[PDB]
Design a protein around this ligand. Structure first.
Ligand SMILES: Nc1ncnc2c1ncn2[C@@H]1O[C@H](COP(=O)(O)OP(=O)(O)O)[C@@H](O)[C@H]1O
Ligand SMILES: [Zn+2]
Lengths: 77, 70, 77, 286, 51, 190, 225, 287
């Protein structure tokens, strides 16, 4: 199983081994339940390209990669 | 420091002010004013406003919620 | 299921006590020169659709950029 | 040419934190960054600024590195933010103009046809206004050199906008300001002008006695360009000049005397008003 | 001067309070009630204060 | 394996001869192409830019992780000027103090296409100053020199010396041949 | 899915929009202070955004405003007052001057008042005489005065307006002259216009003296015109 | 396991950029991410701030493609200081300087990454020249009300040094979150730079304006002072015997003597003695 590295904007790298056939949403729900956040306020960035629905191994990634976790900030009333 | 506080009270000017017409003066720094919304009021006047500028029912600006002469 | 949830959320917002009003005329807003990013606004220059101006039953005439859940071509002043 | 340049206080405050960023060694760290503004007329204004890397040696004034890729990348980035500002020039935090800066300006002149530079004193131990500005011209001389590129001065001042003025006034709460009090800060302005004139004349004397006493070549210009300074300074002990000077001094003294006379009776009015309204009140109260 | 600057700060505080509707008195009533009328709306049978 | 590979290209007067291939410029172009392809065939984190050796040492492309932009900028070099090696290697070393990744090794590869007109002592003190800060330089000879990398093999031997043995000067085969014949021994390392 | 998905997300997008208040600008106070009047009542002082081209915000223009912050949003063209909309683009098509016959003398005299000064404005200047403004038709009923107006209406269709001259009155002391204000202001905005005032004898008439307070409003509509 | 007597440091450039970006998007809410560090467990320092492209509605403002944010925070590591994203800010023009219902929604998301996440609310409308309205909020757990949120081992962040407002106490305040006290840290490099951006060099200090305009200005001021003193005569000599408590009530109109005299004294004296002093300086300094 490929163990990837997620890096936040602040930076406390939430290392988590993933299965090799987790598309986009399984990784998102795993890091959502690990990060205690709801899933819809999430965004995963890898090699300057957003992840939407593709297969993880089809998109890229090997045994270890540095993806970027960013939260969709939002304000208003 | 009083000149600093004289500028400091200008926070209540802000920008969304309604427009009224001054009517008569009652006592020091307190007078009546007629809002253009329709009703008539008895408001407080800031000390920064000079008293030279009010006489023949001139157009003035009032606060929204507090409704005082600013 | 995903679309029907959005269909459920539409009927939630339109509850029942709708105010009635009159349509004054229909407008159309052209874009401007250059809209600044980080201070841009959607309800502005970036709307090439239709628009309307509405006088309410309380004799207060308001404006709306997005006509909403009505086809614009059916509406007449 | 470009007449004069206006600097908003967001720049020249962004510069000092850039000097605090990698000025830990603090010996010859010529920090260079790239300006951002808009030449809305012949007059110019600059509002934003960002960073470019730079390393150079103490000697060997030909080895240096302006990053092309960082400049293009962060320009595209700030264009993705702000589509109004375009690059105007650069700033270096050197206290004096250097020898290799003209190569930097000639390199960066591809992005801007008239790239001004702003010398900003990070540590202005000399009194005066910081952020001087220079631009490149041709100074074809009669000596025999065809042309060179050695810059010239453009007038500069710190301007203001209606939001940054609020910030720089609120952050100025660690200093007493006597600008509101008149007839005092004008005298401090006179004192500051006298000290600046003394400092400039001291620098001129230092250079002239340096080139005078053997050291350094005698520049054939300047010594006759500063000759026309001494052809000025007209005679104070001239008859018609003194005759006009007293004629205007008396005209000013009339207004000063009438101001004192119009002040004294107001003071007396306050005095007798206080005395009457006090004594009658203590007659009632007792 | 210190009373003036303190009054200015407390004036900045107190200016946030509400206003007061003017009116004219029609007639007094029994048990300390008066009949006032505001300008746009109708009449009101209101009470008086202790001062 | 990760480093900021930095190749430099000569554009002197003497670069404009055809003792190799149609010209030395073309063989230099496929040399840089083979170097960049070997960079891409490594771990995909390495960066390649270039510095020229004209009268002014112009850094045409700052250190970048791709390869197509450098290959596009390889064209139109216009080889007019005199080759300088002191200022070129100073700006090459000073160019890599602002690396985006600080774990990358310090490698400078050079193409000397004209006889480098320099004194021995200055190149010796340059070699000492560069080898103090763990920087490794490989040089590839091209064509004529003052007795064919004389005063240069001692430079690279003092650079990788004190039982270090991290550099290897590649002497030019004195003959017109393809650039593949010039990279046969450094197909992996020099 | 199919278009039911794409219609739903645009439906949920549209609900997040809000309304905007419509007002008019009285004058320019400073470079960032603007005094406006909401048309339902009270006036305010507001500010622009940053880039609304404040030279264009002239006194008297119409402009939109936000709800909460109440700032200047976007300038708009002049109002049209949809009573005027119902009498502007409402006439169905008609066939030409062939159906009307026997009035060829009166046909040509109307053509020289209406069509000739706008089609050929140079020939009046050459003599140097201002063209006539309006004309009046009269006669016994059933001879085709309204049909003559339909013939001119379907001739170039410039900006033809059909006044019923009985909806000019209303139940209030105002709103009768105020409609005539917006009609001629609509006539000023679209320059080659034609007003048709059929059956003037309702609104018009003679001048009374202490008749009725009802006649005072009908007269107040009259001498305003 | 304790929220102590906390403190937030903000730099000068952060506040200036904060107010400029808040004013530049005046009618709606603008966005932003803060750059700083946790110097200790007690205090949090913000040394830089930056903005992003946004997309605003009438009531809401959302972000855009966040490859901007990732690449920007990657590139800012290269030049100088490589900090982290310690917080976020927005603006609330003409509002109560408070966390709204959707403002507190993303605060949970920002707090889920790091515990010491600070929200900052600025407002460029109510802010005036002498004072900028500013606030920093820290989200507290809405599940724990029975215990204490901060023990307050001292009296720093309390009714000390600041008081809670009224409109903040309506939309939230000590409910669901709390406030923290802001102080400004000023380094000497910027300290001896900030106090000198108003002066000019020596040509401004030694410059006589002109003598024709000075004579005409003095002529005009004395000319209006004539009629003003003529009004002052009648104002003094009337002085109707009835106690100023109503003489300040008949003064509230257009009446103006006794008040414009001393202002004209000031503008005459402080423009004449300065010019005469500068004339003497110019006539005997240069020689
Ligand atoms: N000159 C004409 N030729 C043919 N038909 C006519 C003529 N004049 C009137 N009509 C008929 O009269 C009708 C129009 O009547 P109306 O408009 O009421 O006349 P008026 O308004 O002059 O009383 C038309 O339907 C048309 O058929
Ligand atoms: Zn908000």
């Amino acid at each position: 199983p490929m163990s990837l590295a997620i890096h936040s904007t602040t930076g406390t790298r939430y290392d988590l081994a993933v299965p090799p056939d987790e598309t986009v949403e399984g990784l998102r729900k795993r890091l959502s339940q690990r990060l205690k956040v709801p899933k819809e306020r999430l965004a995963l960035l890898h090699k300057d390209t957003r992840l939407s629905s593709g297969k993880l191994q089809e998109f890229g990634v090997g045994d270890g990669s540095k993806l970027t976790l960013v939260p969709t900030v939002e304000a208003g009333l | 420091e009083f000149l600093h506080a004289q500028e400091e009270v200008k926070r209540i000017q802000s920008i969304p002010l309604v427009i009224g017409q001054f009517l008569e003066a009652v006592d020091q720094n307190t007078a009546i004013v007629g809002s253009t919304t329709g009703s008539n009021y008895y408001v407080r006047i800031l000390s920064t406003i000079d008293r030279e500028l009010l006489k023949p029912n001139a157009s003035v600006a009032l606060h929204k919620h507090s409704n005082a002469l600013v | 299921d995903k679309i029907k949830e959005n269909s459920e959320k539409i009927k939630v917002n339109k509850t029942l006590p709708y105010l009635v009003s009159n349509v004054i005329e229909l407008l159309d807003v052209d874009p401007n020169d250059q809209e600044e990013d980080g201070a841009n606004i959607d309800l502005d220059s970036q709307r090439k659709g239709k628009c309307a101006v509405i006088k309410t039953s309380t004799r207060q005439t308001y404006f709306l950029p997005v006509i909403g859940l009505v086809d614009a071509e059916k509406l007449k002043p | 040419a470009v007449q004069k340049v206006v600097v908003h206080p967001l720049v020249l405050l962004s510069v000092v934190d850039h000097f605090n960023r990698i000025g830990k060694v603090g010996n010859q760290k010529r920090v260079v960054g790239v300006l951002l503004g808009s030449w809305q007329k012949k007059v110019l204004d600059v509002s934003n600024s960002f960073a470019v890397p730079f390393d150079e040696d103490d000697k060997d004034d030909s080895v240096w590195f302006l990053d092309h890729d960082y400049l293009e990348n962060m320009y595209g980035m700030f264009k993705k933010v702000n589509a109004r500002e375009r690059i105007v020039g650069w700033y270096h935090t050197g206290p004096k103009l250097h020898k290799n800066d003209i190569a930097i300006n000639e390199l960066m002149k591809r992005y801007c046809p008239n790239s001004v530079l702003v010398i900003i004193d990070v540590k202005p131990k000399d009194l005066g206004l910081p952020t001087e500005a220079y631009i490149s011209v041709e100074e074809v001389h009669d000596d025999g050199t065809p042309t060179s590129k050695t810059f010239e001065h453009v007038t500069s001042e710190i301007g203001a906008e209606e939001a940054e003025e609020v910030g720089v006034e609120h952050l100025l709460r660690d200093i007493k300001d006597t600008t509101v009090g008149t007839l005092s800060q004008r005298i401090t302005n006179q004192v500051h002008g006298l000290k600046g004139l003394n400092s400039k004349l001291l620098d001129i004397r230092s250079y002239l006695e340096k080139v005078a006493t053997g050291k350094l070549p005698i520049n054939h210009q300047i010594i006759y360009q500063l000759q026309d300074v001494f052809n000025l300074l007209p005679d104070v002990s001239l008859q018609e000049f003194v005759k006009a000077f007293y004629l205007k001094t008396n005209d000013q003294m009339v207004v000063v005397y009438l101001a004192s006379l119009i002040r004294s009776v107001v003071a007396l009015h306050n005095l007798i008003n206080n005395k009457i309204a006090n004594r009658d009140a203590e007659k009632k109260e007792g | 001067l210190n009373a003036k600057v303190r009054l200015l700060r407390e004036e900045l505080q107190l200016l946030q309070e509400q206003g007061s509707y003017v009116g004219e008195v029609v007639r007094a009533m029994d048990k300390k009630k008066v009949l006032v009328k505001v300008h746009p709306e109708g009449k009101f049978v209101v009470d008086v204060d202790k001062n | 394996v990760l480093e900021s590979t930095m190749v430099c290209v000569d554009n002197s007067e003497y670069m404009r001869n055809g003792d190799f291939l149609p010209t030395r410029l073309q063989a230099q172009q496929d040399a840089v192409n083979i170097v960049c392809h070997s960079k891409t065939r490594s771990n995909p984190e390495n960066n390649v830019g270039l510095i020229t050796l004209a009268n002014d040492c112009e850094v045409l492309t700052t250190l970048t992780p791709d390869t197509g932009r450098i290959l596009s900028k390889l064209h139109t070099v216009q080889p007019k000027g005199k080759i300088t090696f002191c200022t070129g290697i100073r700006v090459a070393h000073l160019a890599l103090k602002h690396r985006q990744g600080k774990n990358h090794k310090m490698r400078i590869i050079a193409f000397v296409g004209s006889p480098v007109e320099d004194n021995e002592k200055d190149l010796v003190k340059l070699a000492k100053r560069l080898k103090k800060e763990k920087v490794n330089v490989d040089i590839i000879n091209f064509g004529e020199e003052e007795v064919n990398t004389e005063k240069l093999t001692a430079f690279v031997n003092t650079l990788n010396g004190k039982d270090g043995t991290g550099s290897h000067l590649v002497t030019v085969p004195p003959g017109p041949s393809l650039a593949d014949a010039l990279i046969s021994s450094p197909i992996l390392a020099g | 899915l199919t278009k039911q998905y794409e219609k739903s997300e645009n439906d949920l997008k549209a609900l997040q929009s809000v309304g905007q208040i419509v007002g008019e600008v009285l004058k320019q106070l400073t470079e960032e202070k603007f005094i406006v009047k909401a048309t339902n009542g009270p006036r305010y002082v507001v500010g622009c955004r940053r880039q609304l081209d404040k030279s264009k915000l002239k006194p008297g223009t119409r402009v939109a405003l936000d709800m909460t912050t109440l700032t200047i949003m976007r300038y708009l063209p002049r109002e049209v007052d949809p009573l005027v909309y119902n009498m502007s683009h409402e006439d169905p098509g008609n066939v030409s001057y062939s159906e009307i016959g026997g009035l060829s003398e009166q046909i040509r005299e109307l053509r020289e008042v209406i069509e000739l000064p706008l089609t050929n404005p140079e020939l009046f200047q050459r003599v140097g005489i201002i063209p006539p403004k309006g004309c009046l038709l009269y006669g016994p009923p059933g001879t085709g005065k309204t049909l003559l107006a339909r013939a001119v209406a379907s001739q170039l269709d410039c900006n033809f307006l059909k006044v019923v001259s009985s909806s000019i009155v209303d139940k209030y002391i105002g709103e009768s002259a105020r409609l005539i204000r917006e009609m001629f202001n609509y006539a000023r905005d679209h320059q080659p216009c034609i007003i048709f005032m059929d059956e003037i004898d309702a609104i018009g008439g003679r001048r009374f003296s202490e008749g009725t307070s009802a006649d005072r409003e009908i007269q107040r509509t009259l001498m305003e015109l | 396991a304790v929220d102590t007597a906390e403190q937030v440091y903000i730099s000068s450039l952060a506040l200036l950029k904060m107010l400029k970006h808040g004013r530049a998007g005046v009618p709606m809410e603008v966005m932003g991410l803060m750059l700083g560090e946790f110097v200790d467990d007690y205090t949090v320092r913000v040394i830089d701030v930056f903005a992003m492209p946004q997309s605003g509605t009438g009531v809401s403002v959302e972000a855009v493609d966040p490859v901007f944010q990732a690449k920007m925070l990657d590139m800012l590591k290269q030049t100088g200081r490589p900090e982290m994203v310690v917080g976020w800010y927005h603006s609330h023009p003409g509002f109560g300087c408070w966390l709204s219902g959707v403002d507190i929604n993303t605060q949970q998301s920002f707090e889920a990454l790091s515990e010491r996440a600070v929200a900052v609310v600025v407002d460029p409308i109510q802010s005036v020249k002498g004072k900028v309205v500013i606030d920093a909020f820290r989200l507290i757990n809405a599940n724990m009300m029975v215990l204490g949120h901060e023990p307050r081992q001292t009296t720093s962040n309390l009714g000390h040094l600041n008081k809670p407002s009224i409109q903040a106490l309506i939309h939230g305040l000590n409910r669901h979150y709390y406030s923290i006290t802001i102080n400004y840290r000023k380094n000497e490099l910027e300290q001896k730079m900030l106090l000198n951006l108003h002066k000019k060099s020596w040509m401004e200090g030694l410059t006589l304006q002109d003598y024709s305009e000075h004579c005409k200005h003095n002529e005009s001021v004395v000319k209006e002072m004539l009629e003003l003193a003529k009004n002052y005569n009648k104002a003094v000599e009337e002085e109707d015997k009835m106690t100023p408590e109503q003489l300040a009530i008949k003064n509230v109109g257009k009446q103006d003597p006794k008040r414009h005299l001393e202002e004209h004294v000031d503008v005459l004296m402080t423009s004449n003695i300065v010019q005469c002093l500068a004339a003497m300086l110019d006539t005997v300094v240069f020689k």
